[PDB]
């Protein structure tokens, strides 16, 4: 009786965490929203900065839940609508000469900003009136996941532009005149492409109240519930699967590996507001936040019960220290991502350069730090009886 309570206080505290980073996400989408608001009605170079700041902003609790993907088939299931990437921009707005798009990717360029009616294959669809709802249904459209009408990166795509700047310093740069209605403006369908970006900024704020509200605490009807009255080693292996599949597939693999081994920037998660390094950094904050049983939410108050960490030292106390370990060295390592951009002006898309040795050195540090850690969590996950953890590795050998 006294092991399942423990385990259930766990589970608890687990489901408080996901309520306080996404409530956090929800309230900075809220905040982004203003701003976005206030740049539509008065676009100008400082009301376009504040866009951008807002979003930079809203990224950093939204990061720290990706590591409940995975173990929590209702996130899975969701984020394809909030947070897919890459993007084949193309789909969206106007393009440079040297776009690089999917190969059997129909609609790379259909251009929605620009025509009223769209073919992608067969599907011939009105977009005359751009509502989140119609935006949402062209995602993957056509069988290509290039094809990503909304999230984070639309967003971003119609804020920053596409980086034309390659692995050199800089980020796109759109111009503020781009949604200047009537004469001044500049790309074309400057009322479409307020349009677009207004459905897709209100669409990402429906859908974080939607999943801020699958955590909340005493609601018979929704995710958490059903979560909390799961056996507790079923909640206990959610866990572990979702620290290890984000660390090992989709952190160190799809996040960092691809790129680095291709020098593909199209292939950064930021592609065009070049923030990759704070997408990287919080993410495996929130595969630490977890293990921990601890979240410092964006008003710098922290959120913290029992942990799972503390099962396992229980268990195996050599097991508990490795981890731990484990996950501070790779903390470290993905902080000298972030102080490479934010001290040295050398962002992700620069650092995966052929030429630049230090660059490359830091991102295989830190994906060799997250295979590590890996095999820490599937050795944790052990000494509690949860065996064959199989965290997901996206197909990468490491
Ligand atoms: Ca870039």
Redesign the pocket.
């Given at each position: 009786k006294v092991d399942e309570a423990a385990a259930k206080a766990v589970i608890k505290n687990y489901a408080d965490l996901a309520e306080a980073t996404f409530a956090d996400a929800l309230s900075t989408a809220k905040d982004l929203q203003k701003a976005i608001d206030a740049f539509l009605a008065k676009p100008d170079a400082e009301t376009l900065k504040a866009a951008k700041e807002a979003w930079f902003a809203a990224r950093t609790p939204y990061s720290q839940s990706e590591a409940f993907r995975f173990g929590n088939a209702i996130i899975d299931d969701w984020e394809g609508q909030v947070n897919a990437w890459p993007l084949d921009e193309g789909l969206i707005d106007y393009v440079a000469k040297d776009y690089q798009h999917a190969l059997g990717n129909p609609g790379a360029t259909a251009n929605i900003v620009a025509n009223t009616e769209i073919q992608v294959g067969e599907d011939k669809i009105d977009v005359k009136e751009i509502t989140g709802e119609k935006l949402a249904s062209l995602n993957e459209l056509g069988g290509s996941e290039a094809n990503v009408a909304t999230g984070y990166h639309a967003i971003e795509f119609l804020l920053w532009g596409q980086?034309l700047?390659?692995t050199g310093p800089g980020?796109?740069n759109r111009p503020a005149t781009d949604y200047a209605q009537g004469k001044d403006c500049t790309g074309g369908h400057c009322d479409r492409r307020a349009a677009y970006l207004k459905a897709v900024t209100d669409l990402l704020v429906s859908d974080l109240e939607y999943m801020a509200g699958q955590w909340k605490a005493g609601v018979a009807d929704n995710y958490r519930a059903k979560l909390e009255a799961e056996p507790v080693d079923t909640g206990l292996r959610k866990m572990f699967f979702g620290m290890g599949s984000l660390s090992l597939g989709e952190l160190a693999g799809e996040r960092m590996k691809v790129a680095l081994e291709a020098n593909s920037?199209e292939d950064?998660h930021?592609?065009?507001?070049?923030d990759?390094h704070h997408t990287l950094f919080f993410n495996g904050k929130s595969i630490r936040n977890i293990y921990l049983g601890e979240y410092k939410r964006i008003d710098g108050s922290v959120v913290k019960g029992p942990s799972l960490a503390d099962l396992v030292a229980k268990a195996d106390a050599a097991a508990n220290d490795t981890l731990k370990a484990d996950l501070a060295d790779t903390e470290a390592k993905l902080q000298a991502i972030v102080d490479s951009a934010e001290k040295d002006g050398v962002?992700?898309?620069q650092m995966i350069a052929p030429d630049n040795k230090d660059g490359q050195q830091k991102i295989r540090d830190a994906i060799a730090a997250l295979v590590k850690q890996t095999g820490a969590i599937e050795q944790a996950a052990g000494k509690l009886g949860i065996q064959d953890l199989k965290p997901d590795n996206a197909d990468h050998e490491f």
């Open positions: 980086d700047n390659g980020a796109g920037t950064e930021d592609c065009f507001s070049d990759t962002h992700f898309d």
